[PDB]
Design a binder for this molecule. Sequence first.
Ligand SMILES: COc1cc(-c2cncc(-c3ccc(C4CCN(C)CC4)cc3)c2C)cc(OC)c1OC
Ligand SMILES: COc1cc(-c2cncc(-c3ccc(C4CCN(C)CC4)cc3)c2C)cc(OC)c1OC
Ligand SMILES: COc1cc(-c2cncc(-c3ccc(C4CCN(C)CC4)cc3)c2C)cc(OC)c1OC
Length: 287
Amino acid sequence: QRTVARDITLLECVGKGRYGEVWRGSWQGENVAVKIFSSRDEKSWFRETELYNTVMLRHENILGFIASDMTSRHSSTQLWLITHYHEMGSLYDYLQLTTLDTVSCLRIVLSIASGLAHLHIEIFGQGKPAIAHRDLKSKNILVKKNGQCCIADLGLAVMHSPRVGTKRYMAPEVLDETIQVDCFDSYKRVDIWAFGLVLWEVARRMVSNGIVEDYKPPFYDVVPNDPSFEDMRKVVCVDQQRPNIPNRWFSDPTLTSLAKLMKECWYQNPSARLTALRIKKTLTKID
Ligand SMILES: COc1cc(-c2cncc(-c3ccc(C4CCN(C)CC4)cc3)c2C)cc(OC)c1OC
Ligand SMILES: COc1cc(-c2cncc(-c3ccc(C4CCN(C)CC4)cc3)c2C)cc(OC)c1OC
Ligand SMILES: COc1cc(-c2cncc(-c3ccc(C4CCN(C)CC4)cc3)c2C)cc(OC)c1OC
């Protein structure tokens, strides 16, 4: 019987953080991405592994799973997650340098909405539990060669049948600790808030009438870098600020429709926010 080639050549590091590292790797000529977890973030490996052991997600707008590997070392355990490799990198990276036209902007945001609705929706029978992401942001979205994106990092995901989200993207009910933690719909509504911020980040980079905004992260003008939980709560909960919509958007029918969409992701009342399925429908009718 058979040879099980497990050797993965780590070729270059494309990411280093408190999470650990991501490497471009090669298995059998074929490019893979290898996330090597820090000790700090072991529970993210376990959670993503537990989810994929429960349901083998397969969707064009979800980063493709290849393998979870645990290897015993002299005095530690090494944890690797192996996925598809997207050489264009994260949406965060991509937006820094690249501007968008109407077609690319819509393709990006509809692909993200598609991936998010896929996570959110329970399918009965080759089915899946409903899933909420809990850390949606432009660094957790990859740009594919075909212009569509895919959602990455299910390390905080929750399923329905001490890692917390990135503070800059936390919904008001997370910051004021009123979120109903027993309620699955609560977690979907937290993802819709974060989606609305991502839609703002992308829409800024769409050119209209020769104008584009510089890349900025959500709330760049009202909080410091690495904003505290308190910094965010005062802006989002107490003062009820929302990202600025520039005047130039209201000359462009695509950006006018997207400003309305992002407004309906940012209601203080979580139950007033649009669903991912309703966002998809709205986006298919733009242009
Ligand atoms: C263990 O570890 C790793 C394994 C592999 C890997 C390498 N060659 C072949 C395989 C393979 C897949 C599937 C079957 C089927 C065929 C027969 N059918 C009736 C049931 C079983 C057999 C063999 C795998 C899974 C790659 C890895 O990394 C890319 C591994 O490390 C994470
Ligand atoms: C993990 O990832 C990759 C794995 C492989 C790979 C290697 N050996 C064998 C296999 C295999 C063969 C046959 C079955 C069976 C299942 C039962 N049914 C009755 C018929 C089909 C399953 C598995 C695969 C899938 C290739 C890959 O890329 C080319 C992988 O991606 C990097
Ligand atoms: C968010 O999360 C995960 C992401 C990935 C992932 C998948 N494809 C590609 C990448 C990537 C490749 C290349 C660049 C740069 C380097 C070269 N040049 C300067 C431009 C582009 C950036 C990023 C990553 C980081 C894998 C993961 O796990 C294995 C992730 O975690 C789940």
